Ligand binder design. Structure first.
Ligand SMILES: Cc1c(Oc2ccccc2OCCn2ccc(=O)[nH]c2=O)cc(F)c2ccc(C#N)cc12
Ligand SMILES: [Mg+2]
Lengths: 402, 549
């Protein structure tokens, strides 16, 4: 492994200089233990003040043992050099494997190491933070799987030879393994792959079913008795859906409210209006016409809090052109909260995004910036980190995707 | 003197050293510079160099009115040198300091000049002492004062130097800040003085002098706008100027000092003054003071009339935070461990939006306190809050945005944080149904707000100098005014709907405030939305009534 791979940055671009977030004494202590041990193993080294670069670090749990997560988003943006199977989403079962440890077998380009610099913060600015840089390929850096790619192909070659119908896609520190086998057979094959990797010195210390994923069809209410207010809600919703589905009409439904009525007045569904509603229920069954994925455009994920542990989400690239929609739910158990559910939702959506298109979406999070920045690590189990921003957009979007 | 290893320094890629010519100086300054530079050359701090050094940096000598000082202008060199790991900008907060029995302040004399400078970089520090006819060439061997790399490299060097002594003395706490060391311990005063002396000699072995006498600084310590006493801390005396006219700059310094005071003086209100500062024009122009700003400043003066202090931190005791309302959108808080012994205080008066409510602002205040607590103590405090579980739970449950509420105990201390009103979730039976609409001409700015009800009541009110949004709000307001205690309201305005559904209890606009007062006076209000220009029924009548005219 003596031969390091020369890594470059995009022309006219300097290394990352991101602020290290303040941490609790617990997390700092954990990071000090972890980095002490990593230093003893030659994985990282202490650096002097001539290194101006910096990358945020966090302590998570992923087990009871603390794990160290590095936010290489900026470095990833500033460093690039060099595929995704479309059949992965078709498979019945898909299992994710952590293969990040392998990266610590390969030395990092000496001239590039300074860009991986990070800081363990002190409490109350008592001392300057403890600064390190990486000597090996660090987890979370998009350069690591790229450099290790040949070795990975080498190790996986026999298994792929044995199992031609099994799909293996790599994203960052993760291996996605998809099969159409029965669940027991699937998990057995997964374990075989695990033991193969292990016996070839690749330590691997979460299974999905994309066969059930879909774009949620818009659902219209069903009532025994309709009030004026109900018909108003229905007409508003159908009007909203008319931007996406062209054949939707509301004339016969809105006709039932002609005049100036009290909101609570009970209105009988005439034959024509019920016909129109039925037709509108039928057109909402078929998928949208002209929506296609563009690999050159950013993926955008919006999320709405629905209450009672329910969260809706949409993935699109252009407005009103949803590539995917969904609804996430969590059993309360009194141990849950908004931040936990939102974090879990973000991770699930990101996973689905990776499986389907092979990249992470840009999130619009319905939460205050500082709150998210404070508590997002508490439930974060993934090794990757998507981009995100913070928004409002409450007013009608909730009840329509509801 | 090279026991201290040097930090390798490079120029920015593609840049060469500075060649700023030496400005002509008077004979006296030349003499002073010659003597000082001979004394520094004698100490090994600088060296005379050959003729083939192409680089130059202007040098000057002055004595601020007895002693002479050499100042070097390293601006060009600094612009041409690499970046370094940013030196500590943030200072420790006094409320975070753990009470020690013994405390010592060590000032390092000639800090920068005691640390060697990277060999290959010394040629770029070249400066010239002017001859009378036309000169003597010099270069630095140590960290120059005013150079870009000096603070960080001195910092690093000091850390590495301190590592062994700290290794052999884990019972001694050493803070490092600029050219100062702050040493604390719980040993007996005598053996504490002994440990201090050991540290002094150790530093002297690396070429770092410390105060030779009984250490020059004694309690209380004046430091970065703070007074550090043995058993307490406070802020240095805040003097608020009294002027007839106020400029932007004066107001900025005023809110600056008030901000500074707020960390220990409970009750400080800066909001109206910053509202005055909303004029982000030049700092020259005169800003007329609002009555609210006058009152605010007056109250601040009344608060600053009394001396206040804070206590130090004890890791064994719990961390507790309390929050009280200060009136219109302003909040104050106290962080303590002992019930009346405050670690520190603070404020929160951000709207972050045109409209909000008490519970939202309270939650935001809690957020700010949480962040600050993590920064200062490395932990989150327990919260004693003037709000009941039913209130907050209802709010965060109905709140469309995700929020994090800590474990807290309800302290009954008026004014309590409450929901002044709650919109209905279902339409109201028996209540009159107002279909409302507002319109405005986007050119003449003229408009009108109107309603039509199911009882057959219709009305239109004229409006001058307005916009469509404000007319929609105006229409909602009109429906509130002319209705009974219960009322259903239907609008086609997503804007107005969004403003009302957020359920604010305070606003920047007086119209929204009036609407709020009305909503409070009501018993049941249900707001419904319909798409405009869809001939819904009720909405079409008010549109035809008000949209065209
Ligand atoms: C003197 C001292 C400190 O002292 C401490 C040094 C090391 C560890 C713990 C300390 O303080 C705990 C709190 N405290 C404080 C003052 C006192 O008199 N007694 C105390 O118990 C800590 C600081 F940030 C100082 C910052 C600037 C200056 C100056 N000039 C002196 C400081
Ligand atoms: Mg309108």
């Amino acid at each position: 492994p003596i031969e390091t791979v020369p890594v470059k940055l995009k022309p006219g671009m300097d290394g990352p200089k991101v602020k290290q977030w303040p941490l609790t004494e617990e997390k700092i202590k954990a990071l000090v233990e972890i980095c002490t041990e990593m230093e003893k193993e030659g994985k990282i080294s202490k650096i002097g003040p001539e290194n101006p670069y910096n990358t945020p670090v966090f302590a998570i749990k992923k087990s009871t043992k603390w794990r160290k997560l590095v936010d290489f988003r900026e470095l990833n943006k500033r460093t690039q050099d060099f595929p995704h199977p479309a059949g992965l989403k078709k498979k019945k079962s898909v299992t994710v494997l952590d293969v990040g440890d392998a990266y610590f077998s390969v030395p990092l380009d000496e001239d590039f190491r300074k860009y991986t610099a990070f800081t363990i913060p002190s409490i109350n600015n008592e001392t300057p933070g403890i600064r390190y840089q990486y000597n090996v390929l660090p987890q979370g850096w998009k350069g690591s799987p790229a450099i290790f790619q040949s070795s990975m192909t080498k190790i996986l070659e026999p298994f792929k030879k044995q199992n031609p119908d099994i799909v293996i896609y790599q994203y960052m520190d993760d291996l996605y393994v998809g099969s159409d086998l029965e669940i027991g057979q699937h998990r057995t094959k997964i374990e075989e792959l695990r033991q193969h990797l292990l016996r070839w010195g690749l330590t691997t210390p979460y299974e999905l079913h994309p066969d059930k994923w879909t774009v949620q069809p818009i659902v219209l209410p069903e009532k025994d008795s309709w009030t004026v207010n109900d018909i108003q809600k229905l007409v508003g919703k159908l009007n909203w859906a008319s931007q996406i589905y062209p054949g939707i009409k509301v004339r016969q439904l809105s006709k039932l409210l002609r005049g100036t009525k009290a909101l609570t007045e009970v209105i009988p569904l005439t034959e024509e209006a019920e016909l129109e509603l039925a037709e509108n229920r039928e057109i909402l069954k078929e998928p949208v016409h002209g929506v296609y994925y563009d690999p050159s455009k950013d993926l955008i994920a919006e999320i709405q809090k629905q209450g009672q542990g329910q969260w809706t989400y949409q993935i699109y690239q252009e407005p009103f052109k949803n590539l995917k929609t969904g609804k996430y739910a969590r059993m309360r158990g009194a141990h849950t909260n908004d931040v936990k559910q939102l974090t879990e939702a973000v991770q699930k959506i990101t996973t689905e995004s990776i499986v389907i298109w092979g990249k992470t979406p840009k999130f619009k999070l319905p939460i205050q910036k500082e709150t998210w920045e404070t508590w997002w690590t508490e439930y974060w189990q993934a090794t990757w980190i998507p981009e995100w921003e913070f928004v409002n957009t409450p007013p009608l979007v909730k009840l329509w995707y509801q | 003197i090279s026991p201290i290893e040097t930090v390798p320094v490079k120029l920015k890629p593609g840049m060469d050293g500075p060649k700023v010519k030496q400005w002509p100086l008077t004979e006296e300054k030349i003499k002073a510079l010659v003597e000082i530079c001979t004394e520094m050359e004698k100490e090994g701090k600088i060296s005379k160099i050959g003729p083939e050094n192409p680089y130059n940096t202007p040098v000057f000598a002055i004595k601020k009115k007895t002693k002479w000082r050499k100042l070097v202008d390293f601006r060009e060199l600094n612009k041409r040198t690499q970046d370094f790991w940013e030196v500590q900008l943030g200072i420790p907060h006094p409320a975070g300091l753990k009470k020690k029995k013994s405390v010592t302040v060590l000032d390092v004399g000639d800090a920068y000049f005691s640390v060697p400078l990277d060999e290959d970089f010394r040629k770029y520090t070249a400066f010239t002492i002017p001859s009378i006819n036309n000169g003597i060439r010099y270069q630095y061997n140590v960290l120059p004062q005013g150079w870009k790399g000096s603070p960080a490299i001195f910092q690093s060097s000091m850390t590495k130097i301190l590592e062994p002594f700290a290794a052999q003395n884990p019972d001694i706490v050493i803070y490092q800040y600029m050219d100062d060391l702050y040493v604390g311990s719980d040993l007996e005063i005598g053996q504490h003085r002994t440990k201090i002396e050991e540290l002094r000699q150790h530093l002297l072995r690396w070429g770092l002098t410390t105060p030779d006498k009984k250490h020059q600084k004694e309690p209380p310590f004046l430091w970065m706008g703070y007074e550090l006493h043995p058993d307490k801390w406070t802020v240095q005396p805040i003097v608020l100027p009294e002027k007839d006219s106020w400029t932007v700059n004066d107001i900025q310094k005023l809110v600056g000092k008030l901000n500074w005071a707020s960390q220990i003086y409970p009750g400080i209100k800066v909001r109206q003054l910053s509202k005055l500062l909303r004029g982000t024009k030049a700092l020259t122009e005169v800003i007329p003071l609002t009555e609210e700003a006058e009152l605010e400043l007056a109250e601040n003066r009344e608060i600053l009339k009394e001396p206040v202090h804070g206590v130090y931190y004890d890791p064994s005791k719990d961390l507790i935070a309390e929050i009280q309302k200060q009136g219109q959108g302003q909040w104050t808080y106290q962080i303590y461990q002992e019930p009346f012994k405050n670690l520190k205080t603070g404020k929160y008066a951000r709207m972050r939006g045109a409209h909000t409510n008490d519970v939202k602002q309270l939650t935001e205040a809690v957020q700010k306190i949480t962040t600050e607590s993590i920064v200062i103590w490395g932990k989150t405090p327990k919260f004693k809050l003037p709000i009941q579980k039913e209130t907050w739970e209802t709010w965060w449950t109905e709140y469309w945005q995700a929020t994090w509420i800590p474990e807290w105990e309800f302290v009954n201390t008026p004014p309590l944080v409450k929901l002044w009103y709650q919109l209905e979730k279902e339409p109201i039976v028996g209540a009159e149904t107002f279909y409302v609409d507002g319109a405005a001409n986007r050119e003449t700015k003229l408009g009108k707000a109107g309603y039509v009800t199911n009882k057959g009541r219709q009305k239109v009110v004229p409006l001058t100098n307005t916009t469509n949004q404000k007319t929609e709000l105006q229409a909602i307001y009109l429906a509130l005014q002319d209705s009974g205690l219960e009322v259903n309201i239907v609008t086609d305005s997503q804007y107005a709907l969004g403003i009302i559904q957020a359920q604010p209890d305070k606003s920047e606009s007086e119209l929204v405030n009036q609407i709020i007062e009305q909503l409070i006076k009501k018993e049941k209000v249900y707001l419904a939305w319909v798409p405009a220009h869809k001939g819904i029924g009720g909405n079409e009548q008010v549109d035809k009534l008000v949209s065209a005219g």
